[PDB]
Design a protein around this ligand. Sequence first.
Ligand SMILES: O=C(Cc1cc(Cl)ccn1)Nc1cncc2ccccc12
Ligand SMILES: O=C(Cc1cc(Cl)ccn1)Nc1cncc2ccccc12
Lengths: 304, 304
Amino acid sequence: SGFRKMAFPSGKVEGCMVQVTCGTTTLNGLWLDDVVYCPRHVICTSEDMLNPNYEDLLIRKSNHNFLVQAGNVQLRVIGHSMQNCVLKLKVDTANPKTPKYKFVRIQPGQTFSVLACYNGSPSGVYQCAMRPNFTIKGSFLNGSCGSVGFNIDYDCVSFCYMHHMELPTGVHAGTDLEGNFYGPFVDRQTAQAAGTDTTITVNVLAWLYAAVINGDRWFLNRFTTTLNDFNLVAMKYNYEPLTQDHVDILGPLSAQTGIAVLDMCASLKELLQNGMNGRTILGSALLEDEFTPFDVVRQCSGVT
Amino acid sequence: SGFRKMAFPSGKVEGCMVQVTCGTTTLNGLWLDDVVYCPRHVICTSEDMLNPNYEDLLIRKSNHNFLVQAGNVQLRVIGHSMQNCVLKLKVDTANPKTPKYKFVRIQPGQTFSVLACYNGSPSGVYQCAMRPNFTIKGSFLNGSCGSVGFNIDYDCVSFCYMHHMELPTGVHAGTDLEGNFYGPFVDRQTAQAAGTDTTITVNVLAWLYAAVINGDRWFLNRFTTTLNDFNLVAMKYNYEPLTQDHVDILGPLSAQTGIAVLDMCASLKELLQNGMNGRTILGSALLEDEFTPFDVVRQCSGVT
Ligand SMILES: O=C(Cc1cc(Cl)ccn1)Nc1cncc2ccccc12
Ligand SMILES: O=C(Cc1cc(Cl)ccn1)Nc1cncc2ccccc12
């Protein structure tokens, strides 16, 4: 029992972290097989970041200008290429610690673990969700760029995020491992609208099921609702509309607790309309949306 | 910017995890150098757990009864001994992945990362605090015993906790790496009083400084207080009394923000007396006490 904001064990990803330096800029890179992946803004100076012409900037750089260090040893760069907002530095040595991996583009509302790094050295690991507006509410400082987000299924690491930027609002933006930004963001030092965010309804419902599994049951009521009635409440409280696909993903949690999905929706409706009344659920005084239904079952069943 | 419940990267600890089986019981062990450390209740059957005579139970066991597996390879046990509530299984092979390590007994109110494991395989990592009453509010299922808590300083892992038991209340109890329980607990299946817990005042103050650093400032007020006046409030709200030693540990955060410790105490006093009024601080609707002053500076400065 107990429910924590649990991250995947980071060891497999720690073995892939390297430092990448170009000119006077240093950030993190991800070394998989014979390629190091890093944000393309490593080629910029502070004067370039206002509106960089990355193609022109990269043309002034040669393989020997990209300094890649894995711990204390230097990697030899034999090729470089820009793919969207990432650079791919081909090196002459395959990373001996390359785990089984995939590059995936996650959907908004899904979760992943972040291994925050500075100078190619891991500093910490935390779990977070990709917001519906494609930002992440991470914890990152200058030099964290190139830190990655991932999920792990047995021995396979699915990399889903590479950190690129902190928006003036203090929220974070980044790309998939092919260098495509999540959301409307561009790698420039300019104010950029993130757009209206919403609460991940399916995740709040999953977390309410996790609370019932772990003994926090005070919020259960004698009511039920419909998807239509619940979605009117969701609209008013800036929650994502619940669909049958979300109800289907909540199936296993519903069977475990014997609480029909629409009955749990009625509990969520009452919490939205009345608040918590100074009470807590799983050590929180707000409705938590950073746990997917898969996360709840994995944590409540013990997948390794 | 951003503030997360960040755990240490778990790689160095992942390399130490093994599975230990004795009879029909399997749990986790920690393999450091040529010794595997695990909870002594691995020698018990369910009939023994009501009140085990561990000395008698261990006398029936020989080196060959302790099955230790590191991934897919079997370790040869050449010695066994009980130290308090842990068994130390001497093996013929030093763990090649043994990091630089220390065994430390942490104080209540301090934090550490937990690498939750099942069958010697890591499942997840989370950060938590040792409660003032010596329990931990972890996330653990059957078979998690032997999972460890630790801190990392550059390349040295300081192991501070080994998971042993879930109390009937759903909270967790365990030992230091010499097998001494934190708190009054005994390794038996019996209801055991944990005793009155308190909120870790110095950690709440540290987290309020983290909020100011990250832009959440609505709770700052035009008031100040004294240690005496603040401690009357702390008494009423079941908070640990603040001492000059705690004020001294808050020094660096106080100098960073320019907010005197007693001025922040006045903000904490007002939050305790008035609540949050439906507002949040660093994504929380309650006062968070699982971040020490060291944690806040490490996260807000980027130590790797
Ligand atoms: O955002 C940037 C640099 C950069 C990259 C791009 Cl692609 C566009 C503009 N500027 N760096 C940072 C990332 N994450 C947290 C940071 C906290 C403080 C300072 C800097 C941080
Ligand atoms: O507590 C025990 C077993 C045990 C050990 C001792 Cl030392 C005394 C009594 N019983 N195991 C568990 C530990 N952590 C979370 C668990 C969640 C569910 C079931 C079992 C869990």
